[PDB]
A paper describes a structure:
Here we address the question of how two homologous [name] Ψ synthases, [name] and RluF, selectively modify adjacent bases on a stem-loop of [name] 23S rRNA. [name] is specific for [name] whereas RluF is selective for [name], but also modifies [name] to a small extent.
The S4 domain (residues 1–60) is not visible in the structure of apo-[name] indicating that this domain is either disordered or flexible in the absence of RNA; flexibility between the S4 domain and the catalytic core has also been reported for the Ψ synthases RsuA and RluD. First, the residues that form two C-terminal turns of helix α2 in RluF form a loop in [name]. In the apo-[name] structure residues 131–138 form a loop, whereas in the apo-RluF structure these residues are a two-turn extension of a helix (α2 in RluF) that directly overlaps the bulge-binding site. There are three major conformational changes to [name] that occur upon RNA binding. Superposition of the apo-[name] and the RNA-bound [name] structures results in a large rmsd of 2.1 Å (over 185 Cαs), however individually the subdomains align closely. Finally, residues 132–134 in the loop between α1 and β4 refold into a 310 helix and bind to the RNA near the bulge.
Residue numbers in the entry: 65 to 251
């Protein structure tokens, strides 16, 4: 029946599978147990990737959101080990060649500076598995922590803590259905 959407702040170490016969933590463990409907993940995140992951009860909405007809930026807050040479930044912004062909960061802004380890905020328009890690890897830099903070026009909710979820209201939901050319819900 009604289209519900959740915004979840995935912690590192959680699986994206619906269940694990070992009892290992999954992104579905703390979601609200519904009935007569089923949460569906809008895409997936690597086990070691934190941040925004949408869920929705509506299969069509999930389809159109991870398969957009328009190129969508994904923004990540990245913590990297040690200080990064400026030329390495030039490479990442000009492009490198990895296992699945060339790739590049559409944007690289240096964020905070925690001791010797550095923070960068980067964006990309593709979404090949572990692309962000492999990008930094191809330039000789290991990734410490990786948070997804924005998918297109959708950022992590401000209050929302690590491992928590927030339900979108009808207006926010309809905003999503509009960005994807779906008719608006009325209740
Ligand atoms: Cl973290
Ligand atoms: Pt997917
Ligand atoms: Pt994290």
């Amino acid at each position: 029946q009604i289209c519900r959407v959740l915004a979840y702040y995935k912690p590192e170490g959680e699986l994206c599978t619906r269940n694990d016969p070992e009892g290992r933590p999954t992104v579905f463990d703390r979601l609200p147990k519904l009935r007569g409907a089923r949460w569906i993940a809008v895409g997936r995140l690597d086990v070691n990737t934190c941040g925004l992951l949408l869920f929705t009860t509506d299969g069509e909405l999930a389809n159109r959101l991870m398969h957009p007809s328009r190129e969508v930026e994904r923004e990540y807050a990245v913590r990297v080990f040690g200080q990064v040479d400026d030329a390495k930044l030039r490479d990442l912004s000009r492009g490198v060649q990895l296992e699945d062909g060339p790739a590049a960061f559409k944007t690289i802004k240096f964020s905070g500076g925690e001791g010797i380890n550095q923070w960068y905020n980067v964006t990309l328009t593709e979404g090949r598995n572990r692309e962000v890690r492999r990008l930094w890897e191809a330039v000789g830099v290991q990734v410490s922590r990786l948070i997804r903070v924005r998918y297109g026009d959708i950022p992590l909710p401000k209050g929302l803590p690590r491992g928590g979820w927030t339900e979108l209201d009808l207006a926010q939901t309809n905003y999503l259905r509009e960005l994807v050319e779906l008719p608006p819900e009325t209740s």
